[PDB]
Amino acid sequence: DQALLLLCGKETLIPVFLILFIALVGLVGNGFVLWLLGFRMRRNAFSVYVLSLAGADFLFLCFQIINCLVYLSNFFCSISINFPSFFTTVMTCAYLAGLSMLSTVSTERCLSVLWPIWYRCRRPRHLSAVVCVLLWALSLLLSILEGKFCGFLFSDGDSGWCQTFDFITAAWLIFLFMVLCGSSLALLVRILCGSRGLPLTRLYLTILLTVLVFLLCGLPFGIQWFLILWIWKDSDVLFCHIHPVSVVLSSLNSSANPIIYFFVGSFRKQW
Numbered sequence: 264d265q266a267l268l269l270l271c272g273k274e275t276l277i278p279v280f281l282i283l284f285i286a287l288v289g290l291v292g293n294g295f296v297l298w299l300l301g302f303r304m305r306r307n308a309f310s311v312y313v314l315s316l317a318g319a320d321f322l323f324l325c326f327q328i329i330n331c332l333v334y335l336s337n338f339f340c341s342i343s344i345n346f347p348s349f350f351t352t353v354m355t356c357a358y359l360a361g362l363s364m365l366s367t368v369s370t371e372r373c374l375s376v377l378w379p380i381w382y383r384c385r386r387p388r389h390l391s392a393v394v395c396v397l398l399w400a401l402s403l404l405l406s407i408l409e410g411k412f413c414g415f416l417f418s419d420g421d422s423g424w425c426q427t428f429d430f431i432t433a434a435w436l437i438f439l440f441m442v443l444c445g446s447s448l449a450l451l452v453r454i455l456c457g458s459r460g461l462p463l464t465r466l467y468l469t470i471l472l473t474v475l476v477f478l479l480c481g482l483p484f485g486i487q488w489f490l491i492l493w494i495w496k497d498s499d500v501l502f503c504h505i506h507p508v509s510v511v512l513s514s515l516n517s518s519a520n521p522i523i524y525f526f527v528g529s530f531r532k533q534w
């Protein structure tokens with residue numbers, strides 16, 4: 264029955280305006296991707312991954328808009344809105360499903376270049392939906408399990424298991440980062456060693472652009488939330504600075520993902 268942004272208050276205020284502006288424009292971009300790929304556009308097998316990534320970003324950015332408006336309602340007009348603490352569990356489920364969708368997209372590009380005749384012919388057509396519902400289900404499972412052992416789900420919880428599942432989510436996140444780097448490196452090795460007709464500069468820049476956007480925008484909230492708070496053992500004086508700048512980086516990730524994975528790839532027809 265508390266907000267995670269009222270620990271300091273006056274020092275936190277300008278990242279909340281960044282969180283609100285970036286989160287509304289990312290909600291607009293994810294809403295356009297969700298509307299277009301849900302109804303208007305025709306979906307291939309990669310568009311299932313782009314759609315489920317925009318759904319994860321939509322859930323994460325609307326929950327960041329809610330936790331922004333709770334701080335803004337407490338700061339300006341002074342109303343302590345007690346939005347329930349199981350919203351944090353669905354926010355982390357959205358965050359983990361978004362980062363797993365980024366590693367899935369990178370693995371799918373690596374598989375399309377390394378085994379191209381299998382990917383054109385023998386790949387099953389429902390593999391995207393299967394892999395999406397398993398990664399969403401496992402991210403949801405880790406999220407409800409962590410929020411139930413850390414007390415976000417109906418206020419029962421023991422620490423000694425809460426840190427051992429926060430370490431599990433941190434290990435899963437660095438595993439997703441190493442899967443994205445291994446797939447984006449094997450794809451770049453095959454493209455810069457063994458191509459004949461490809462645009463190599465745009466492909467190289469797009470691949471390491473997704474890698475750096477992952478590493479310096481998606482990942483820092485998960486490292487500062489599931490791992491750094493147990494190992495740094497300081498609760499106030501760094502945490503009021505390193506938490507909302509991490510939320511600004513995560514909202515920048517969830518705002519940049521609809522552009523990079525849908526709009527840049529498809530809407531180059533416009534200009």
Ligand SMILES: CNCCc1ccc(OC)c(Cc2cc(CCNC)cc(Cc3cc(CCNC)ccc3OC)c2OC)c1
Nearest residue numbers: 267413414420421422423425429488489492493497498499
């Ligand atoms: C001065 N008092 C202020 C109160 C205060 C301080 C810090 C703080 O964020 C950590 C929070 C919010 C909060 C955030 C998380 C997110 C990361 N893992 C889920 C987890 C928990 C549960 C928790 C944390 C610790 C050590 C955390 N060290 C800072 C120990 C046991 C424990 O529950 C078993 C939290 O507690 C509500 C609240």
Ligand SMILES: CC(C)CCC[C@@H](C)[C@H]1CC[C@H]2[C@@H]3CC=C4C[C@@H](O)CC[C@]4(C)[C@H]3CC[C@]12C
Nearest residue numbers: 311314315318319391392395396399400401403
């Ligand atoms: C089993 C539980 C955890 C899954 C439910 C998760 C919810 C939030 C939603 C959000 C967006 C949804 C996806 C949106 C797009 C499609 C494409 C469709 O052709 C197969 C289902 C699939 C892939 C949906 C699966 C479920 C999904 C990921």
